């Protein structure tokens, strides 16, 4: 037979997912060139 | 609060544990000696200045 006869039966076909980027973009830290950093746990 | 532990440098759990121990010892003196001081003594158990 032809494949088009069994194209409806999606459970028989293997599942391959189109790997596309999803979700909001990674957030970069833009302030660091402006701000000088001092770290001290006992502030 | 978490701010008290973090921002108040002098504060720490050692101070609280010290007060638990102190008030606990003061409780031991109370529960064991309060029956003596607080009793309503009868005339048989009272003795005057003399």
Report resolution in angstroms: 3.3
Distance CA A12, CA A5 (A): 12
Q: Please list, residue by residue across B14-42, b when 16 or more beta carbons sit within 10 angstroms of its beta carbon and e when fewer do.
A: eeeeeeeeeeeeeeeeeeeeeeeeeeeee
- As given in the structure block, the two tokens for residue A35 are 């701000």
Which technique was the structure solved with, according to the deposited record?
cryo-EM
Q: With beta carbons less than 8 A apart as the criterion, state whether B42 and B35 touch.
A: no
Q: Distance from CA of residue A17 to its chain's centroid?
A: 13
Distance CA B29, CA B36 (A): 11
3-state secondary structure (DSSP) of residue B1? coil
Query: What phi, psi does A32 have (nearest 5°)?
Result: -60, -40
């Amino acid at each position: 037979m032809t494949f088009s006869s069994t194209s409806n039966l999606k459970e028989l076909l293997r599942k391959v997912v189109l790997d596309v980027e999803l979700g909001r973009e990674q957030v970069q830290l833009l302030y660091k060139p402006i701000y000088d950093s001092i770290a001290d746990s006992n502030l | 609060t978490k701010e008290m532990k973090d921002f108040n440098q002098t504060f720490s759990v050692e101070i609280l544990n010290k007060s638990i121990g102190e008030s606990y010892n003061a409780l031991l003196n109370h529960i064991h000696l309060s029956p003596i001081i607080n009793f309503n003594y009868k005339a048989s158990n009272k003795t005057a200045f003399k």
